[PDB]
């Protein structure tokens, strides 16, 4: 937007790539029903994978996707780049900033992250412990 524009000359982002490739989580650039296969099959409510997002996004870079009890929900994770931090969800009066994706994870890991479907108002909240990463694989078709 007002810092990014064509070309690479802004890579702000790609960075954080660097420290996100081969996580058993990230998902990548995957298509996103795939995502929620590889979770679906796991059953096991904690599972998540980090999935990129569409090409040229700002306000939206990755999106965070916690597996449940056979449920599946994708919380899109905006980054205020305004401090460069990284949250869950659109904005509340007091969201959690963080400085990373990573960060996201590594917190969860051990602090719960409620997960509150807009559609589904069920107040359950899981500590990441499984990482499902999903794969296409080199055969390509």
């Known amino acids: 937007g007002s810092s990014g524009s064509s070309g690479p000359f802004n890579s702000t982002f790609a960075d954080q790539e660097a420290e996100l490739l081969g996580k058993p989580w ?5 298509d996103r029903k795939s995502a929620e296969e590889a979770l679906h099959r796991s059953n096991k409510d904690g599972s998540f994978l980090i999935r990129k997002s569409s090409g040229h996004d700002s306000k939206q870079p990755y999106t965070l996707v916690a597996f449940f009890n056979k449920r599946v929900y994708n919380i899109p994770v905006r980054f205020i ?9 659109k904005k509340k009066n007091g969201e959690e900033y963080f400085g990373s994706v990573v960060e996201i994870v590594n ?12 559609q589904n108002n069920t107040k359950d909240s899981t500590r990441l412990k499984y990482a499902v990463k999903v794969s296409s694989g080199p055969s390509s078709g």
């Open 107 to 118: 917190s969860h890991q051990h602090n719960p992250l409620v997960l509150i479907d807009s």
């Open 81 to 89: 780049e305004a401090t460069k931090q990284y949250a869950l969800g």
């Open 26 to 30: 990230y998902a990548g650039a995957c």
